[PDB]
Structures are given as structure tokens and as C-alpha cells.
Amino acid sequence: ISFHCYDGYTLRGSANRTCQVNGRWSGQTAICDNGAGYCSNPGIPIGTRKVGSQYRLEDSVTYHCSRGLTLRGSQRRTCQEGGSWSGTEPS
Amino acid sequence: QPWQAKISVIRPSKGHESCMGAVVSEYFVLTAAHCFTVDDKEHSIKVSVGGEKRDLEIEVVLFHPNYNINGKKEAGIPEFYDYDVALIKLKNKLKYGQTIRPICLPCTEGTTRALRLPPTTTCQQQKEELLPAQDIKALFVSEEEKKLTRKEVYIKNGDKKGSCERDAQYAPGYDKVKDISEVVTPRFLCTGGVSPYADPNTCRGDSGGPLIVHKRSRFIQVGVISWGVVDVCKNQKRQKQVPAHARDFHINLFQVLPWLKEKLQDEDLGFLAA
Amino acid sequence: TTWEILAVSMSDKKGICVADPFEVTVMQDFFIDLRLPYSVVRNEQVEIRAVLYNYRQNQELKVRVELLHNPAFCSLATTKRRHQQTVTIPPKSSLSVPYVIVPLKTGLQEVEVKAAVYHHFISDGVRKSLKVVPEGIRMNKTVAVRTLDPERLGREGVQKEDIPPADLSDQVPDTESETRILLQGTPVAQMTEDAVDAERLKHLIVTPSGCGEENMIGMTPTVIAVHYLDETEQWEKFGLEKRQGALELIKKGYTQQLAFRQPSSAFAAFVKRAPSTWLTAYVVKVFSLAVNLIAIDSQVLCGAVKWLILEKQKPDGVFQEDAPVIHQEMIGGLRNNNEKDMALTAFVLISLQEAKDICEEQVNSLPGSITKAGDFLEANYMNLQRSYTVAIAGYALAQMGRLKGPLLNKFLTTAKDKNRWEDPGKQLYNVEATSYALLALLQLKDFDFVPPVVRWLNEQRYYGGGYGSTQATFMVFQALAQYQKDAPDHQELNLDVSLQLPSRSSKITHRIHWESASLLRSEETKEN
Amino acid sequence: SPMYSIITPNILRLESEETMVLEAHDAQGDVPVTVTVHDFPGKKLVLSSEKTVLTPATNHMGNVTFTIPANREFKKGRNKFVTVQATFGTQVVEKVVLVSLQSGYLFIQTDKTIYTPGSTVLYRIFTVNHKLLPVGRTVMVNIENPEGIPVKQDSLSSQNQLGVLPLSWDIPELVNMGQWKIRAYYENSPQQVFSTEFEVKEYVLPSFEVIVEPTEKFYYIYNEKGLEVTITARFLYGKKVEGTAFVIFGIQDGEQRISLPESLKRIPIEDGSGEVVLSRKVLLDGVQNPRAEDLVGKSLYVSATVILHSGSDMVQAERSGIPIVTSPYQIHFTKTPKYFKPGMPFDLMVFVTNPDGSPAYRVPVAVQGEDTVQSLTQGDGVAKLSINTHPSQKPLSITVRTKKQELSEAEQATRTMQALPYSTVGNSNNYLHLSVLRTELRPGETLNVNFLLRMDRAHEAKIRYYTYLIMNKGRLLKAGRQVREPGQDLVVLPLSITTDFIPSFRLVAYYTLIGASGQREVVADSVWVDVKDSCVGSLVVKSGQSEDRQPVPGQQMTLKIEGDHGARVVLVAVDKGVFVLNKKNKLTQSKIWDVVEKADIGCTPGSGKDYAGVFSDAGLTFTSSSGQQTAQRAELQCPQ
Ligand SMILES: *[C@@H]1O[C@H](CO)[C@@H](O[C@@H]2O[C@H](CO)[C@@H](O[C@@H]3O[C@H](CO)[C@@H](O)[C@H](O)[C@@H]3O)[C@H](O)[C@H]2NC(C)=O)[C@H](O)[C@H]1NC(C)=O
Ligand SMILES: *[C@@H]1O[C@H](CO)[C@@H](O[C@@H]2O[C@H](CO)[C@@H](O)[C@H](O)[C@H]2NC(C)=O)[C@H](O)[C@H]1NC(C)=O
């Protein structure tokens, strides 16, 4: 499966990803960002769902996994001063 | 700022050149290439680090092969700060202390760990990390009344990059440049201005200094303070009335890697192939 | 639904073109329509409706719809029980299935309803998100509204301003809140006086003719006219296109004036008459102004300058008149002999400084001569009596920046009612003197004392021209034209506002400029 | 005595190529020409210099084009001019011309028409010149909140981007509801600002749409039947709606509405259709004014509301601005010239429209003066009339009416205009008229331009040629000659219409001779002509599928795109449920030409008060060495 970004948006991360035998997608998470916020777009790891579009300072986001799947990492990440989301990327 | 290096040059009555650099290894000191000239001999160039009173004796100054500041006099361009980088190989090995430490350089195994990336990280991936497509938050060290102080700035690498580059037309001499892209090569990072914030402007004495990105409790040099559009610095204070087009340009280290990787090969910095 | 695709082509050859909308309908025989509100209040029991459509032409469907469990909601559906009904949907019809739930937590939550038909390979599900706004009401307290303006309410150029924390005493329990800090520049454009209408100057276009002096008197009204119209840009109302006819007159008079240029690079009424120090210096004044209008020979322009410096100049820097012009009316306020050393030395000195940028390469003794004359005028400026001399001399010192202290105080107080430098007798001498003073003010950049002066000249309606008006014409329009360039539209707009929050390590620095003024610059803070 | 003339547009444009027509009457052999353009005021040289030689092999016409800076020397208020100069060997002819700071056109496109707080606005800026072509320019972009205060501003550049600037703005969760605005402009033209609006509001897309189309696009006052309105409601996927409808009426006169509580109805919606009527009784009873003619001019508005039997969705619709006119038609002389030639035929461009503004197809029109002289209105809503004029210098007054059968004279429309005589140089009664067969012109066809002359045989043998100039989008598309032998009162011009003439083009023709006592006389005339307004090239979007049935949620479908070669195609798909809440500010090709045409340097539909007037009114500046020059132009936009 391959990923593509709308106009005015830059793509960082694996453009093409392949479903491997370990039940995981190859490469890194695809993220379509416009680089217009204090912090960059945290992205939406495959299999999860992000709640929070504002990427200002002090802002936050929350991730939820599909039914039957367990979330690894942080479920909530806050944009900290110095351009860097707290916690770690979900999975 | 242990990596901070203070470079001075003595010239026959002409005056003294005041630049800065960074300690990248036990022998080398990365700085700007316009701080020196082919005429300046080693005996007239003194480098001081760690705040030590004494001056270190240099062995040789390595300019970048493509550095030609006068390669535009025909087109009517007096200055041409393209590939404005140089290394200073010391005559003595530096003893790393609490005042003297190196600063991380792009595309090195040592930097990968600093960013906490997998060892299998390619050079290209590091650039996407350090210099993403946005307004990257950075900083540089300036001299404030014989006292070093940091200055936080924003590298306009996003969509504001265009707004920042074209402002080079206001710079002295460039006023009659046909294509502004002819004086701002892809080897330049742009900082300063009013958007998204009011960034501090680099001074003449800060020229050659490191453009640092503080991430995850680690400092990574990604540029060398080359030249600014407006000279707000004037050994009396800082021109409290800075224009909106007062931009500052630097040298993107990811653009002179071949030269760095080569000259520093015997420094155990572990540069990445790519 | 039906998607409306819209295409826009851009050809470098053809051009731009937006195509006609292309619609694409996307329907299904059996589907679920889960319509949810924009937002719902927490803890308040609401009802959502699930409409199961059945567009099968002739066949009823035995469906079984179910609502999935969600900890963020409170329905009859638990983790171990399935809240599911079984209904029969007639052909070409629909059915609504009621669902009662209660939002247990705020934020964007997920609702999902599935359904499958019996005895068929048909099924469908819908998963949408609904907002859960906390119970209460959207309020907004204006903490404060300060005015930024160092100097007026500042100190040493800086201005500190504390801002008390928000009240929020009656805030709803367990709810967020953001403080919206906001800056904006406020222009502030003012001043500038009206310029004299070009329509009032349809008589200054005179054809230069006569002897070495009568030629200059006829060339002056034309040169200073075009010069005033080029600045104020009033060629539209004046006539336009007629400017070409005015230029040929300036060039015509220029060439004629050369016929009265003696080999000594000086000038006089006739080629036989003794050289005149004043007329020669005056020629430099006019020529140095018409350099932007026509082609002026540097050999001639600098020739007259060198003649004044080397020949007609004492070590004192004083310039003396040997052969006064026959036309004592074109010399303006110099006809009166009270203080001729201070008046003539200044008059000639000005002509040199207005040609300094031109004769700075050919005449090496210029910067020296300029300094000499300046030293003499600065020694007798405190002894002057007539308001006229005080002006013409003050403007000469102003161009050097040597008009400070006592000398500056006298130049300002000399003006009666702080709007004119007048002397008992004649009009020519009053308008001319005031014009010199105005040029001196514009030189000192004191735009606080200027408005009254400029307004006075305007409220006196002097359109030049006439007998002996050579000096009053060239000077009054030279000063008013200069005022139209040194006149700002607004005042300085460069605010360096920086706000430091206790919850933040670094300051938030902003800079407001004139152009970027009136710009909404907000910094949000989820913390009070 | 040789005469050298020069013709350039009233206003010169920066960073473009303005055409310049050179002529010489008559002289012989070769004649070198050195065109030099300076600034103003002052002879500050040089902006653009060109050269050319007029050879008798080309009938003494030259095609020289120059490109004006493109200089930072052109920087508030007032206007800037340039000294356009042309030397014909020795005789120098000069003329000052106005300069426009306008760079070109900017078009802003937004995916949706309305956005919810939290979403992102995807918009694109198109950077074209004064010819609608891609170009690399620096553009300033602002974003004003509903209260007109900028919240974000950037400085982009379409350089190396092919005249397309992809952009986006993130809408804060805590944002201000209302009509937001995206303003933009070229850096070299801060005054000329382009803008597009988009609504920010909390909403949810409906499941079906609602339409309210009255039986007529207006209402006749004395119509006892009343106002019958149809209520069509169907789902977004085509199917028909089953529900109830609440319809009400009201009157609008000014920026003020007056509801009619008495006109409330509740009609059923079966098979996705309904029917409601507004009794004339309730209408008149709505107000209170005994007279019914006082309602003439006012308008009615309908407010419908459909509700499904499931009570799951509810949509509100509205049809406002229903003209209550006495005559089902209107007449406008906006396309007809305001100047006539004594004795010569005077043509009229009658513009018959409907109460709403839409063109009226096939509508008989005639003049109070002569009967039988009629002409059925075409599809474009334009008729072709032509009345005879007397040699008198008395102002001409025309009154055109509608001989539409099936309608009394009391229910017909009427309009009256006034034309003025064409002043003659020396009263020599020398005129010129350009009659053109009024038919819908289309790219690729051919148009016959007629040159009708009027003068005594005393000097008719001196008229050996005319000089026609094609005006288009504010530039010189082409300039040629039209031969003529002594005795020919009417000649024809084989004009080929291409894609360039789009959307509209003006045609000016002038002839010069030494008739009368002995003095270079000039006579000219202009005529505006519309062309089938459409895309210069082409762009189609049809389905790739082999027809078949309808797609299914989550299916692949082919999308065929037929456009021009090497062209860039930017796409966008929008749910029709969106336009149900807002269908305004949609980017359309018709709206593009609208901007182009509403920017012409010409004002008068044709002809003028004299020879130097026809030029200025058309958009040209005639200047010669004999003395005859056109009027001065200071204002940028047309008068009034
Ligand atoms: C994600 O997948 C696509 C599909 O492969 C990648 O685009 C492809 O780029 C490659 C390298 O240029 C192209 O390979 C071509 O294969 C044909 C086969 O005959 C050969 O004739 C060409 O010489 C060439 O080797 C391929 O055409 C192209 N696919 C397209 C344009 O449809 C893309 O790079 C991948 N994204 C990543 C991983 O960054
Ligand atoms: C806080 O700000 C809001 C939004 O500006 C204010 O809401 C006002 O309410 C009126 C009611 O008629 C509406 O027209 C507008 O939404 C707002 N009015 C204007 C013009 O500001 C609100 O008043 C403010 N504070 C309060 C009392 O809630």
C-alpha cells in the first residue's frame, strides 16, 4: 500500500509500505504535514486514530487502536516548548 | 558552550578580523571561510577555546575547494559567500574538559545515537529529522559584553523560505542583482525576520559561529553563520530599530558533507556512507 | 451521495480553463444512515436515529441491526450483552431505529452501528464521530486591555506591564480553558500640508532672453516651475505634454547664458563688463538645480565654482562683490547694505554646497573653501540684527550641521510668531527670508517648527513672477518643493513587544512595523 | 506634406509587450524609425528602444512591440506616465501615455464553500498576466476574519511553479463564526487586490436537497391565478423524498423584508414532489396599500422546509428576489453606441432580458418610428435594428418596444435613449460607418466587416485605403489595411475569427486625406463585438467506465480527462451536500471572462463625439505630426 499527500503538503516517511510476515507494515509511518505549527504533525501510525488537529504549543493529541488491538506507547502526546511532542510514537 | 571557539586575525594596520568557530574534533575547528584570506599566514591567525587566556598555534587552514568570493565580479556581485566554510587544524591535540568539548556534526554515527535513531539510519533520514520542511527552531551563540549568551532563532525552511531568501536584495551590493537566486545557492539556510517571530540578528563578531539545533538534551550543528542582510551590530549596542528584511544566511552542513567527511576521515567521527 | 468533480487546466500555451462539473453518484441497495448532531452535552441523555434504507425494487429484508459497545457512552449495550434488534424492511422503503445513549466523557467520541440481512450475503456498518461538549456555557472574560507606547507611558524607552490572572472562579469542574494574548499595531498616519496648485503657475513659463542678467531673470521662472511640478507631480492638472515646451526653453536659455561666459569661467551683464561675483554664484545655484532637467557641462558649472574660490575669496572666507549687477532687483534681499559680508558670503557659500556633489572631483579646493566660509559665518551669527540675514546665513550653516547651541537658539527666536522671518519693508525680502529659513528647518529635520512656517507661506498665496521677484520666486518654490519630499505620511512604527510567561522558559518576542501593522498576533495559553 | 501617425493603447502595462502601430501618409521609399520610451516627468532614459523601417512593400505599416519595466523606479497615490516617442528620420512624434501598475489577474480557488471549526482550508492561487497565461510572480496573501482583520499573511511566489500556488490554512477549534476572506495581490500592485470568501460555521451535511422553482421567473401584478411554486426534493443520490413541507412567503423591498404570516402552507411531499400556491388575495392582504401598482418593483421570496417521515433530517431552502414586474421583458441600450452619423444608417444593439436578468429567446422588437422593421431576438438576448437618420445635427432619440403577441400593449416594456451627432473636422461632413452582421460569432468562423463611406466626389478619389485595428483584452491583437478604389462606397473585410478574439473585441477604422480648404482631416469609427465566450482551449471530464450501472462505496472508477497538451490539471471532488448550505463563490469559467471583460480600457460601445474621441473611447491614442492628437487620459478606470 502506498501513500500520497494533497497539494501544499509535504510527505515524510515511507511512501510505499508492504505487509510483512511479522504482521507489521514495512518502513516508517507516512505523515502528510504542512509545517505550519510550532510542532510538526505527529502523524497517524497505521492502525490507530488521532484526535487533535491543532499542533500549537501546549496543544495535545490522543490515539486509539482498533478493536482487538493493544496500543503500545503513549495514548496522549503534548506539544512541548522547543518543538517536540511528549511521550513516544504510538503503535 | 564548550564547543565555542574564538578566532582572531592580525593584519598590518588594516585592523583585526573577529570571527567565531566550533570545536568539531580534537584537532579541527569548523568556521567560516571569509574570516581568512590566501594572504593571511598561520602566524597571524590565533585561535582561542574554552575561554583560555592563551592562544593556540594553528597548523593550516583548509578552505572549501569551491570557495570563490570574487567569482561574481563580472555579474556585478562583489560578495559571493557560496560554500563559505573552512577548517582549522591545530598544532596540538585538545584535552577535552569541562570547558572544552566537541559539537555533533550531521551524518555521523555519534549524532544518530544523539537523535536516538536506529543504527541503520541513512544520511538522508537524518536531514529529514534535523531539517524538516517547516520553521525549524534553532539557536546560535553571540558575544554580549565579553560574555557568551544564546540567541533563539527560527530556520525558515518551510513555505517562508521564499519570503526570507528574496530579502537578500536589500543587502549591500546585491541591490542590482538580476536573479536573486544567483546569490543564494541551495547551500544556504535562512533565519531571522519577524515571522513567525522576531528573531535576534547575528553580529559581525558572531560570523563563522555554529547554527545549532537543541534536541533531546543534545546540541547538533547544522550550519555556519555566513552573512547577514542588515548590519544591526555596531560595537556600541544593537540597532534597536531592525528592519523587517534583516535576514541572516548560513551554510547548510548537509551540502558540504563530501568535504567534511574527507578532511575529518581520521577523527573517529564515523561519517555515514550514503 | 453524488461527488462533484471539478477540473482546472493550466496551459503555458493555451491558457487557463475550468471545466464543467462532472457528477458521480454512489448508491447501494442496502445501507445505514447514522445521522448524529454536531455536538452533544456530557451526562445528558440523548437519542440518535439509525435509518436503514432498502432500495431493493421488489424484496423485503429481514435485517438485524446492532449498536456496538463503548465505555464513553451509556447504552443498554454492555461488554457482555449485545443491544440488537431484528426488523423487517419492506421493499423500496426505509426504517428508523432509535438508540438512547449518554455521553460519559468529553472530547470527540466514536459511534458505530452494524447490520446484516438474513438468508443473504448483505451487510453494512457505519462509524462516525460526534463531539461531546462539557455541560455549562461558553464564556469569555476580558482580563485587560493595555495600550503599548513607550516614551509616552514608558521610561528609558521601555514599558513594563503586568497582567492579573483570569478570575474563572465560577468555572465548570474538570474543564480546560485557554487565555488568548493578542497584539496589534495602530497607525497613526498624519501631517503633510497641501502644495500650491499648478493651475496657479501658468505664467512662470517665460522664454529666457536678454543680456547676461536679463537672460537669467527669464530663465529662473521656468526652471523653478518645472522643478516644483516634478516633485508635487501636478503635470496632470497643469496641462501635461506642455512640459516638453518648457524643457526646450531651459536648454535655450542655458545655451544663451554661455554666450555671456567670460574666459575666466565667470559671468557678467556683458562680455566687456567686469566679472560679477554675485551673478556668477547665482548661475551656479540655478545650473546645479537644472542638472536633473537638462545636460549641464561640468567644465562650465565647476568653472564658475573654481573662479569664486581661487580668485574672489579672502583667507577669511569672505566673498566680495566687485561689479554689482545693473539689475539691483534680481539680487533680492541683498540690495540693502546692512551686513553685506554675512549676506554675500552665505549666498555664495550655498551655491557651492548645492554644487558640491558635482564639483567634488574637479575642484580640490572646494571642501577647504566651504570650511573657510563656514568659520566666518559662525563667528558673526550672534551679532546679526536683520531677520533676513539671520535666515540666509542659518541655512548656510545648517547644510554643515554647524548650527547648534546659541546660534540655533537665535535662528529660531528671530522668527516673529514662530511662523515667519520678516523685516520692516517690502514683500520680496520677507517671503525670500522665510523660504531660506524653511530650507534650514528641513535641513535640521525639525518637523515640529516647520508646519507653522509652511502654512504661513501657503496662507500668503505668492505665485512668484513680477519685477525683482527673481529671488522670491526661485526660493519660495525651492523650499515648498523640498518640503514635499521631507514630509512623512506617518510616525515611526517599530514596536518590540515581548511577553514572558512563568510556565514558559523563553520569551515571546514580536516586532510590529508600519506595513505589518493592524495584524492579529495571538499567543494562546491553556494555563491560567 | 508627409504625415506620420502613431497608435498605442490608452494605458500601457508593466512587465508585458504592448503593440505599437506605425504609419506614414504618404511619402515614398524607405523611412527609418527609432522608437524610444522614457519615463515621466523627466527624460530619464532608457526604458525600451526599438527600430524598424517602413517599406512601400508593406504599405508603410510597422509592427514594433516593446516591454516596459519591471523597474523599482515605479513606486503612493497619483499616477505614473511614460514619454512614448517615435522618430521618423527627422520628424519626431511624441506622446505621453498613462501607465498601469496592474501585473495581471489572480484567481483564488477553495475546495469547499463552507468549513467547520477544526478543519483545514485548501486553496490555490492562479497567477496569470493580462492575457490569461501562466507567469512567475511574487504574490502577497492575507487572511481576514469576519470583522476584516488580518490574522495571517505570507509572501509566496509562483516562480517555477507554473502559475499555481497550492496553499492551506488551519482553522482553530476556537475560531470566530462568519464569512472569512482570503485576500491576495501581486507585490508590484498593492492597490489591485483579489479576494474570495468562505463561510465558517458549525453544521452537518443534509441527506437530501430542496428546490423551489416558481412556475414563472417573476410575477404579473394583475395575475389572479397568483404565484404557483413547485417543491422538488430528492436525496443526494437521486432517489425521491417522502415527507412533509412547510412553505411560507414574504415581500422584500430594500434591505428590509416583510414576512406574510397569512401565507403559511403545509403541503405533502409524495414521490419527491409538491405544489403550493400563493393566492393573490393573501398577497395584497399581506401589505395594506389599496393600490396594487405600488408593489411593482418589489419582490417576493419563498421559504420551504422539507421533513422526512422518519424525522431524522430537516432541510431548509429559499428562493428570493422574485421581480413583480408589469412587463415580462426588459430593454437595455447598454450595447448600443451613443453617437450617430447624420444621414447614414444607425444600427441598434437591442438587449432584451427577463425580469431576473436572463436573456430572452425570440422576442420581436421594433421602433416607434417605422413598422415592419422588426427582428426576433437571438439566443444571446440581442436584436439587430437599423433606422434611417437625417443630415440634421439634431440629437437623435429612439424608442424601442416589444411587439410580442399574446400580450397587450399595457403589459409591454419600453426604453428610450439619446445619441449625439459626430463632430466633423471643418464640417466637411466626412463620416465613416462600420456595419456588421450581428450573429453569434464562434472561434473558427468568418466575419464580414463593412466599411461604409460618406463624402462628396470632390475628394473621394483620395481615399485609397482604410486602417482597421483589433482591440482585445486591452491590447492590439492585429492591425491592417483595407484597399479601396474611387467609386466604391462600400467595401468588405474578410475577418477570420480565432480563439484569440475571445471574449470580446473592438474594431476601429480610420481614413486620412487632404480634402477641404487644405488641412489634414481625420475620420474614424469603432464597433464592439462579442464572441461565443468559452475556454481558449478545452478541458473535459467524463467517466472511464463503460457506462454500466452506478458505482459502490469503496470502488475503483476510471476518470477520463481530455485537455490541452502539456497542460497541468488540478482536481478536486466535493460532496453535493455541501452546496446545499452554500453554493456561492464557486470558481467558474464564466466568472473568469467576467473579470477580464470588466477591465477593458474602452467604455463606449462604439463611436464618439469626434475623431479623437472614437480612439479614447475604444482604448487607443492617436497622435501625428500634423497636430491631431487624442484626448489626455488621467483616470485609470472609465468615467462615472
Ligand atoms: C512506490 O511505488 C512506485 C511503483 O514502483 C514507485 O514508482 C516507480 O519508480 C520506479 C523507479 O523509477 C519506476 O520503475 C520503472 O519500472 C519500469 C518497468 O518496465 C521500467 O521500464 C522503468 O525503467 C523503471 O525502472 C516506476 O515506473 C515507477 N512507478 C510508476 C511511475 O508508476 C515509487 O518510487 C515508490 N515510492 C517510493 C518507494 O518512494
Ligand atoms: C465573548 O465573545 C463572544 C464572541 O465575540 C461574544 O458573543 C457576542 O454575542 C452576540 C449576541 O448577540 C453575538 O452577536 C456575537 O457572537 C458577539 N457580539 C459581538 C459583536 O461581539 C460575547 O459577547 C463575549 N462575552 C460574552 C458576554 O459572552
Ligand SMILES: *[C@@H]1O[C@H](CO)[C@@H](O[C@@H]2O[C@H](CO)[C@@H](O)[C@H](O)[C@H]2NC(C)=O)[C@H](O)[C@H]1NC(C)=O
Ligand atoms: C507583427 O509583425 C509582423 C510584421 O513584421 C506581423 O506579425 C505576424 O502576425 C501574423 C498573424 O497576423 C503571423 O502570421 C506572422 O507570423 C507574424 N509575424 C511574425 C514574424 O511572426 C504583423 O504585421 C504584426 N502583427 C500585429 C500585432 O499587428
Ligand SMILES: [Mg+2]
Ligand atoms: Mg461573448
